[PDB]
Amino acid sequence: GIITVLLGATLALAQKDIKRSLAYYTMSQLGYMMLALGMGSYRTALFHLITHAYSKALLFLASGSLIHSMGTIVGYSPDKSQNMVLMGGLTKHVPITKTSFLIGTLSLCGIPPLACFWSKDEILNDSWVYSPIFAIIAYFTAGLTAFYMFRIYLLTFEGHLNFFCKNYSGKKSSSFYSISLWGKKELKTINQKISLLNLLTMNNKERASFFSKYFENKNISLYPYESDNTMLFPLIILIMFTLFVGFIGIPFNQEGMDLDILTKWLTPSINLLHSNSENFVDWYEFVINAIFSISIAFFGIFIAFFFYKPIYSSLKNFDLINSFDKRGQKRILGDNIITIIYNWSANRGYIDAFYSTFLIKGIRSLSELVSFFDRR
């Protein structure tokens, strides 16, 4: 469970596909469930399963609706319609999907009072009771989870539409109108010369002096929009589930001795770590003992905000970015994380390729060898 937790957390840091990162940290949360089962926390593992299933369905359906929205402007190719690089600035276009994705992210970043916060910090406390090394790994994973989830959210909803951004995309320019910039004297499909571009229309720069040996398309304003209501209604229901399903493992309106719904449901339940403490937790007291998990999650969120929030956001200070000028593309930073993390995430942790190199091809050869012994 803890190995799966660390691998799934570290494999979703530098992904460009939204669904692949969703799968990888789904694997991470399942590893968390198995880690809780490893210490004998039956009720805690079932609580995390209940909360994570609803939050995961919410996030996956939101991502699918958003991919459906983007497919009208980038096409139906999943290499383009699931790329978070070309996906920024969708807050203005899909607001309901934005709220659903944000709620799922906050739930699975361990932020109160959402669903998975209670289950996750119960798991972390039980793991600290279990062993300190596992607790260290799990808390670092919680911070990493906050980082890559808000990385996904900022890459996918905040900023500008990178596919339709006029900084890069030359198709959505102002030169394709019949209105010419200079006046009523410009027309015709122009065919230029690199020499003219080199002299910069400042004739005096003619020193090369030799060699070394498209309109009519028409453009319209297209914007992504929210999907149909049949897609939106389960998103609303899953928003309600994500908001109000964490109260089945926590006591709802505790007044003295009160057992929650889940512990009354699982009245005979294995609990190896807390086999002697019949304690009743409190709704407004658990956020006091969960300062560490929320602090590490907020540290990861701060890192994600520094990395991926837009320049026009008030939370991003100009002086702090100036301190991160990194002039000279400092090689001490480039191969410390960025190259290593990107190669780890892109190569899928190098296990799968090994499974191709060692097992798959090998078994193929074995098959041929057996066929040879059956033929000659």
Partner 1 sequence: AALVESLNDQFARKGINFLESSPIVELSVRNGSSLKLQLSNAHVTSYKPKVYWKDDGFEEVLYTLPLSKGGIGLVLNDVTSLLAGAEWSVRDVDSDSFDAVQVELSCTSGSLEITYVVSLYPESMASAVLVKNNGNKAIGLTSAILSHIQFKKRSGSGIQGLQGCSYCSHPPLSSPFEIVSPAEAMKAKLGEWTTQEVPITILKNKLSRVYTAPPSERSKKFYRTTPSKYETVDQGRELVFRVIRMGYDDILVSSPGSLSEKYGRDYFICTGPASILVPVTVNPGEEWRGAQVIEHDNLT
Partner 2 sequence: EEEELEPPYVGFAFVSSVLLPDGTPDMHLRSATGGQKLRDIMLDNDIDLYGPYARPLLNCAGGGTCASCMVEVIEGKELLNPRTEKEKEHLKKKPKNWRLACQITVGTPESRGMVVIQQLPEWKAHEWKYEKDGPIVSE
Instruction: DSSP letter for 282, please.
Output: -
Task: Please give the backbone phi and psi of residue 17, each rounded to the nearest 5 degrees, phi first.
Answer: -90, 130
Q: Are 82 and 18 in contact (CB under 8 A)?
A: yes
Instruction: Decide whether 317 or 336 has the Cβ nearer to ligand PGT.
Output: 336
Q: Is 354 in the site for ligand PGT (CB under 6 A)?
A: yes
Instruction: Decide whether 192 or 314 has the Cβ nearer to partner 1.
Output: 314
Question: Would residue 342 be called left, alpha or beta, if left means φ above 0 and alpha means ψ between -120 and 50 degrees?
Answer: alpha
Rounded to the nearest whole angstrom, what is the least distance from the CB of residue 192 to partner 2 in the complex?
5
Q: Is 317 in the site for ligand PGT (CB under 6 A)?
A: no
Contact region with partner 2 (CB under 8 A), list: 45-53, 60-68, 187-195, 232-240: 187-195
Q: Which does 207 bind (CB under 5 to 8 A by kind): ligand PGT, partner 2, partner 1, none?
A: partner 1
Q: Which residues pair with 83 in a beta bridge?
A: 17
The size of the interface with ligand PGT (CB under 6 A), counted in residues, is 7
Q: Is 305 helix (H, G, I), strand (E, B) or coil?
A: helix
Q: Is 73 in the site for partner 2 (CB under 8 A)?
A: no
Q: Are 91 and 98 in contact (CB under 8 A)?
A: yes
Task: Please give the backbone phi and psi of residue 180, each rounded to the nearest 5 degrees, phi first.
Answer: -85, 145
Contact region with ligand PGT (CB under 6 A), list: 267-275, 284-292, 306-314, 353-361: 353-361
Q: What is the CA radius of gyration of the chain?
A: 27
Q: Which does 151 bind (CB under 5 to 8 A by kind): ligand PGT, partner 1, partner 2, none?
A: partner 2
Q: Are 104 and 55 in contact (CB under 8 A)?
A: yes
Rounded to the nearest whole angstrom, what is the least distance from the CB of residue 107 to ligand PGT in the complex?
27
Give the Cβ contact number of residue 281 at 10 Å. Answer: 15
Rounded to the nearest whole angstrom, what is the least distance from the CB of residue 129 to ligand PGT in the complex?
26
Instruction: Report how far residue 356's alpha carbon sits from residue 334's, in angstroms, rounded to the nearest whole number.
Output: 29
Q: Are 104 and 62 in contact (CB under 8 A)?
A: yes
Rounded to the nearest whole angstrom, what is the least distance from the CB of residue 356 to ligand PGT in the complex?
8
Rounded to the nearest whole angstrom, what is the least distance from the CB of residue 227 to partner 1 in the complex?
17
Instruction: Report how far residue 11's alpha carbon sits from residue 28's, in angstroms, rounded to the nearest whole number.
Output: 9
Q: Is 334 helix (H, G, I), strand (E, B) or coil?
A: helix
Q: Is 136 in the site for ligand PGT (CB under 6 A)?
A: no
Contact region with ligand PGT (CB under 6 A), list: 159-167, 172-180, 184-192, 350-358: 350-358
Residues in contact with partner 2 by CB under 8 A are 13-14, 16, 85-86, 88, 151, 155, 162, 165-171, 173-175, 180-182, 186, 189-194, 197-198, 200, 211-214, 307-308, 328-329, 334-335, 338-339, 341-343, 345-347
Q: Which residues bind ligand PGT (CB under 6 A)?
A: 10, 340, 350-351, 353-354, 357
